[PDB]
Structures are given as C-alpha cells and as structure tokens.
Design a protein around this ligand. Structure first.
Ligand SMILES: [K+]
Ligand SMILES: [K+]
Ligand SMILES: [K+]
Ligand SMILES: [K+]
Ligand SMILES: [K+]
Ligand SMILES: [K+]
Ligand SMILES: [Mg+2]
Ligand SMILES: [Mg+2]
Ligand SMILES: [Mg+2]
Ligand SMILES: [Mg+2]
Ligand SMILES: [Mg+2]
Ligand SMILES: [Mg+2]
Ligand SMILES: [Mg+2]
Ligand SMILES: [Mg+2]
Ligand SMILES: [Mg+2]
Ligand SMILES: [Mg+2]
Ligand SMILES: [Mg+2]
Ligand SMILES: [Mg+2]
Ligand SMILES: [Zn+2]
Ligand SMILES: [Zn+2]
Lengths: 124, 96, 75, 55, 58, 100
RNA sequence: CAGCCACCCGAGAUUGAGCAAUAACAGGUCUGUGAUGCCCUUAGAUGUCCGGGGCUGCACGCGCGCUACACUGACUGGCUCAGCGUGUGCCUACCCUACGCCGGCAGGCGCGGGUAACCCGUUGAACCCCAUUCGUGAUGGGGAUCGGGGAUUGCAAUUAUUCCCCAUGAACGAGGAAUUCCCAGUAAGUGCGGGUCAUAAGCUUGCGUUGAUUAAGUCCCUGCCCUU
RNA sequence: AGGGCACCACCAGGAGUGGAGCCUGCGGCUUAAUUUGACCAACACGGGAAACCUCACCCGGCCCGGACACGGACAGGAUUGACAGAUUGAUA
C-alpha cells in the first residue's frame, strides 16, 4: 500500500530529524550522517528546496544538476529532479521514496553496458 | 609576479642581511621558514629570487629539492640602491 | 628523542645530500669529498682550495651560511 | 575564490602526500627507517648513506 | 571561448565621494581596519565596503 | 659518587672497540670501578629492492644492510672526572651518550 | 704425479650467499631523476590546480597464483613449542601496544609502557599432539555466488575499501595433449615478520617449525662448449 | 666424425602446473576514456595492492606559478580583490 521505510511512512520520515533518521538508516548511511554533511551537500539541499518551492502546483520541479554522486538520498529529497553527473553527462533522475538511503551515483551509470563484437586478429 | 611590496622588501632585506638565501622548491608552502613572522609565501620567495637571477643579481644552485642563491656584486649594488641603505652597510658574508 | 635506527639513517642521508650539493657547487674547483666530524666541523677536500675559499673567504662563508640555513643548524 | 580552491584537495595520506626527497617522484618510494627515497635514488645513494651489500 | 572580465575605468572616482564646506556623500565603513578613509559602496539595495566585504542591507 | 652510564654506538666494530678499550684504560688509570663493556645485540637494518630502474629482465634483488653496534660502560666517578675521561680523542663514526 | 674412493678421529671431511673478465645486444628504461640532444606544445596549454568519471568495464584466449576435491579428513574442546624483524616520523597528517571496563563479534571507552636486549614480549604462532562428533553420502568435504544487518579507515566507500554476524551452498570425486621446479634440514606441509599501507595481501622478500621418497649417474631429449 | 658439461637437460623419483572456483597480469572485445611500457631474456613485471591523490586517459572549469629586455598605456590611477543578485557541479 503506502510507502514505508523501516515501517515508517514518508510523512513521519519528513518530520524526523537527522538523529532520528540515523537509527532508521543502514550502518553506512548512519556513519555518514554522524560524521556530518558538508557545505556542498547543504548547498545541494538548499537548491532542491528552492526548486520545490518554485515548482508550479501539480508540476515537477526544475532539474538541479550536481556532481555529488556520493550524496545520501534523504527523505526531503524525494520528488526532486536531479541531474547526476556520470563523468560525461548529467543523467536526469527523479527521486522515488524507495530510493531513500541510496547514493545518487547508484542511479547514474558511469559506463556503457558491453555488447561484444567479433574477436580481433589473434585472440586465440 | 604580482607580489605585495612589503613582501618583496622583506625578501630583499633578508637576502641583503644574510648574503644568501635558501628555499625548498615548494610553491604550496604557506610560509618561508625564515620569513614566517612576515607572512611571506615560499612561492613569493622563489619568484623574487628567480627575477633577481634573470637580472644577474644572484647566482643560483639547485640540489635535491632546495634552491640556494648567493648575492653577486651587481646584486649588492642593486639591493643597496633599492633599499636606500647606507654604503657602509654590507652583507654578513662580506662583513665577516 | 629519536630511535637509533632513524638517527643513523638520518646522518647518512645528511651526508649524502651534503656531498651532492658540494659536488654540484664545487665541481670546477676539484672537489673530491667531504668529511663531517661532530660545534660541527665540515671538511671539504679539493685540489684547488683557493677557489673554494674565494676572495678573502667570501665563498666559504657563503657555503657555511647556506649549509646552516638549509640543514637548520644553530647559528 | 581561487585561493580557497587552489590546492584544496586533502593530502594528509596516500601516494599524493609523499614523494622522493631527492627527485620528487612518487613511485617506488621507500619509507622504512624514514628514508623517504625512491628505489632508484636509494640505489644511487646507498653507499653514501651507509648501506652495503654484505649478503 | 570564455571572455575575460575587463575592468570599467572610472575617471576621477574620488570626485564622486565628496561635495564641496565639505560633504562626504558615500558612507564610511565602521571597521577597525578600514576607518573613515575607506568609503562604502552604495548599491541599489545595500552598502558594501570593498576592503573588508562588510555589507549593510537597507 | 654518581653512577655514570656511557652508551657508545657505531657502524664500525673496530673503531667502536678501540674507543671502548681506550675509555676503559683511562678509567683504570684513574683507578675507578668500571663495569666492562656490555655488548647489546647488533641491529641489522635491511633494505631489499629490485636492481633494475625499470621493470624489465630477470627479477634480481639487492640486499643492502647496515649494522649498528652498541656498547654500555658503567662508572662510579665524579661528573668532572667522567667528562675528563670522555674528553680523550674519539674516533669518527662513534656516537657517545653520557648519562648520570 | 696431479688427484680420486673408503674409513678413524673430529662440531664440521663439499653450509649458503655476495662480488664477478674480454667482447657484445640497435635487449629494457628518456614514465626514477634539477640526467640529457633534437623535435613537439606553451595561456581556448600537452604547464598547473579543482570537480566528476576511467585505469576494475566482459561472448573469448593465455600466463603467475590461492583454495580444494576429503577419514593420512572436517568439526568442537584440551594441551604444548619458534625465528627473522618492526614500532611515536623535517616537510608528514599516519606508531607498537599491555591492563581494566562495555559489547556475542567486528569494535568502543579509560588508563599506562616503549624513540626500545628496558614496553608490547617468556613474542602462550600454525601445522603437530590428546580427546569429541561426523561415517563414504557433492556429505558436517568445498566455499564460489548472493540477500539482510552491524562496525572501522577516510573529505568521500555506489561500480560492494577492509572487517564482523545470520543466511544462501556453485563447480570440483585428483585433471587430455603438454609442461615446471627440485637432491638434505633440501622438496613439500605450516604459520609468522618486512615492503606496499589512512584503510591493506590470494603478491613479493625474509623467518622459523614439521620433515621425506629417489640419486652419487649419463649424453638418450633440450641446450651450451671443445677438437678434427 | 669424435669428446665434454648442466635437475633453468635427462635418468630414478617427489611436489606439482595444465582440468574446477576464485585472485591477479596480458591479448581481444567494449568504451567518452577503459592511459601506457615490455611479447628463454614480456604476461603478482614497471617495486604497478589506482575510491580521491597517484594519473599519464575522458568530460568540464579556475589559475599563470609567461623570468628578463624593448615599446605602449598610466598617480587626472597601470592594475588588485570582492558583498549581494544572476550564473555555475561548486561559496571558482
Ligand atoms: K632513465
Ligand atoms: K628526452
Ligand atoms: K625526462
Ligand atoms: K610507470
Ligand atoms: K621512482
Ligand atoms: K593441476
Ligand atoms: Mg630496442
Ligand atoms: Mg590495470
Ligand atoms: Mg567445511
Ligand atoms: Mg554440501
Ligand atoms: Mg605488486
Ligand atoms: Mg625445461
Ligand atoms: Mg622426468
Ligand atoms: Mg588452472
Ligand atoms: Mg640462460
Ligand atoms: Mg584499490
Ligand atoms: Mg583517479
Ligand atoms: Mg582528478
Ligand atoms: Zn628519487
Ligand atoms: Zn570595511
């Protein structure tokens, strides 16, 4: 039915603070949040909030581009449009609730999947 | 390079007082050890000494990772004129 | 305080760097080697000691000054 | 500004924080006993330092 | 190709800070380093000292 | 008086032994109770490294080593007498540390 | 004669390495170097720094290796033995750790020692030894792959850094043609140090521990050398 | 044609490798890039166990750390740095 993370609905997740979210997150994300977000992450969060506020009603917000592939997907980021750099291109990703706790990089693949051609000269 | 005149004057004064100069060949060292109280960057020291060498005022040697610079006679005259020092004032290498 | 292993390795490294610097500085003057006896006395062996000393010892004073500045010896 | 960005990547550890004390190369470095010399420079200066091939 | 910034030269800028009895039109920066000599920029919505980046919004 | 410990360290066994023998002879001449030279275990610093500057050829290795030899001497003497005894000519390469 | 074989006495009757000629190779390295000629580039840089990605990408072929295919074993207890060597650092951030307490574990907190024959440390190592359970079953052999969770390093762990816990439980039943290394404290088994190292060994370089079968010959194969 | 020598030859053997899973290096393929050298005497070799750095490769963006000489512009200012708001991956 409705989305739940560790048995907590999205609205309660939005209500929760960082210290409360740390107990819900896995060990890696909990350690990351305990060590603390930096200026770049805070700037990205501010950009996402501004895009959400400026979004017209019943319309997706403008895409916010970023290099931060190691950004934790916080509940407040759900619904945002993020252009995650993959080293060459800003791939557009819409944050779904089920993405909570993952890294943005996990949704912007850095390589092209291999389709093999005929083996070359030699290669016995 | 673009350098504060106080930094350039401090470098020149140290060079004239000692007769020699030593640097570590490190453009990222925040302070030259002998000019730390003056807040003179090691990059500024390196580039000022490079300019003096190009004008023939110092002789340069390089060993491992350190620059060594020695004041020439033309350098002594030029620095005396630049710093307006009395003609009696001399670098320590000549003084001793 | 420093361990004996590190101390001996450091003394060797200091001698190596000093010999390299003097080799580059005094090659044309017949420099052959350096002996360090611990005041710290540094003896420079050369074929033409007049050029090593320079005009009234000016060059040897310059060498002493740069050595002291680079290796952090007290004045 | 450029002062905040230039050389601002942390270099407290890893290869990028160490280099040969002779030639500034970052590869084949010997840190044992605090030598901090690349292997080629060490072979060049071993006799001067005091290492010999008894073996 | 990215174009480099070109400084817009202003002729006798100091002439715009004073009116001749003398009157200092531009507000002076109230900082220990700057003092009375340095004047604060009068932007459309703020006062901005160039030397120490001190900004007083309207 | 005070108990003086002299620690001698060297890379040259022959010079180290000569200095130790001279110090003990001086102490005997001054008629001092001197504990003989206690020989600490020799330290062998080793560096094993590839011979080639590149990565080509048979993988041959150089085994460099440095040997550090340590001696201890104990004396029961005044500090001035100990300094006078240690004031004798010391061979190069021998490091002497005196502790009271 | 040179010397060879055996034996007595003897600790030992061939310990192991390092060094290493003349003359060569268009062998490797200009990506070790403030070694270097020439050429190229030099501000929209092939300089330099910063951010991100890649060097790891997967129908396949080859080489060095690790773990195994089990009972001469695996598991669970108990007992009892090393040696080499490192350890708090110019820049330089980063040391080895005893003891006490918390936690099931990885770990955390406190409090001390050591710049070292001084402290870790009598370095309570593994194999091995003594008992236990298993019972010829791809099985309690094997531990790949994979899910979930917890820690630590780090500015940052996703394309899993490493570590811990539960779970999952693949091939593999001794390997074709071919081919490597080796003769005594050697081969092989077994663990421990050093290098790399913030994080860190399936590599390498050393160390001990247990400890053999076979041979004391030949030019058949592969090569090298000499004479005609 | 004859004669020597060598467990990087064989003989007598031991342990194996070649088969499996995995680690790791090389080719090939793929890619924006998958940087590159090396083909008995290359292929856990470059001490090469690369998250960043390393880095040499790809995408993008700062900086000059272009000495010195000559000429020009300049104290009626050559030039430097920067708050905000735009802009930007970025509080370049
Ligand atoms: K070379
Ligand atoms: K070249
Ligand atoms: K070069
Ligand atoms: K290389
Ligand atoms: K190197
Ligand atoms: K096999
Ligand atoms: Mg060639
Ligand atoms: Mg690779
Ligand atoms: Mg099992
Ligand atoms: Mg099974
Ligand atoms: Mg390796
Ligand atoms: Mg063979
Ligand atoms: Mg055979
Ligand atoms: Mg195989
Ligand atoms: Mg051969
Ligand atoms: Mg890695
Ligand atoms: Mg990289
Ligand atoms: Mg980079
Ligand atoms: Zn080097
Ligand atoms: Zn101000």
């Amino acid at each position: 039915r409705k989305f739940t993370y560790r048995g907590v609905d999205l609205d309660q997740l939005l209500d929760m603070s960082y210290e409360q979210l740390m107990q819900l997150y896995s060990a890696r994300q909990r350690r990351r949040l305990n060590r603390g977000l930096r200026r770049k992450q805070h700037s990205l969060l501010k950009r996402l909030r501004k895009a959400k506020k400026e979004a017209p009603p019943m319309e997706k917000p403008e895409v916010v581009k970023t290099h931060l592939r190691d950004m934790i997907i916080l509940p407040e980021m759900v619904g945002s449009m993020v252009g995650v750099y993959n080293g060459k291109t800003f791939n557009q990703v819409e944050i779904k609730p089920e993405m909570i706790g993952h890294y943005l990089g996990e949704f912007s693949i850095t390589y092209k999947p291999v389709k093999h051609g005929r083996p070359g000269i030699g290669a016995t | 390079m673009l350098m504060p005149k106080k930094n350039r004057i401090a470098i020149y004064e140290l060079l004239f007082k000692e007769g020699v100069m030593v640097a570590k060949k490190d453009v990222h060292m925040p302070k030259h050890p002998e000019l730390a109280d003056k807040n003179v960057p090691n990059l500024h020291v390196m580039k000022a000494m490079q300019s003096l060498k190009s004008r023939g005022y110092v002789k340069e040697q390089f060993a491992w990772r350190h620059f060594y610079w020695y004041l020439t006679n033309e350098g002594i005259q030029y620095l005396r004129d630049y710093l307006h020092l009395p003609p009696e004032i001399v670098p320590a290498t000549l003084r001793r | 305080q420093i361990s004996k292993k590190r101390k001996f390795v450091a003394d060797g490294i200091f001698k190596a760097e000093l010999n390299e610097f003097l080799t580059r500085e005094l090659a044309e003057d017949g420099y052959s080697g350096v002996e360090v006896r611990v005041r710290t006395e540094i003896i420079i062996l050369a074929t033409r000691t007049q050029n090593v000393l320079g005009e009234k010892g000016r060059r040897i004073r310059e060498l002493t000054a740069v050595v002291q500045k680079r290796f952090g010896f007290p004045e | 500004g450029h002062q905040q960005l230039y050389w601002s990547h942390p270099r407290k550890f890893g290869q990028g924080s160490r280099s040969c004390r002779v030639c500034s190369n970052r590869h084949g470095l010997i840190r044992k006993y605090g030598l901090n010399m690349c292997r080629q420079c060490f072979r060049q200066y071993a006799k001067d330092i005091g290492f010999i091939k008894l073996d | 190709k990215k174009n480099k910034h070109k400084r817009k030269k202003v002729k006798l800028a100091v002439l715009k800070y004073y009116k001749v009895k003398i009157s200092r039109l531009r507000r002076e920066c109230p900082s220990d380093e700057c003092g009375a000599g340095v004047f604060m920029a009068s932007h459309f919505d703020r006062h901005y000292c160039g030397k120490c980046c001190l900004t007083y919004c309207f | 008086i005070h108990r003086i410990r002299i620690t001698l360290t060297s890379r040259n066994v022959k010079s180290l032994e000569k200095v130790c023998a001279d110090l003990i002879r001086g102490a005997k001449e001054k008629n001092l109770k001197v504990k003989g030279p206690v020989r600490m275990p020799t330290k062998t610093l080793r560096i094993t490294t590839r011979k080639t500057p590149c990565g080509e050829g048979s993988k041959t290795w150089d085994r460099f080593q440095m040997r550090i030899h340590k001696r201890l001497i104990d004396l029961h003497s005044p500090s001035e007498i100990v300094k006078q005894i240690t004031s004798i000519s010391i061979e190069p390469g021998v490091e002497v540390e005196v502790t009271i």
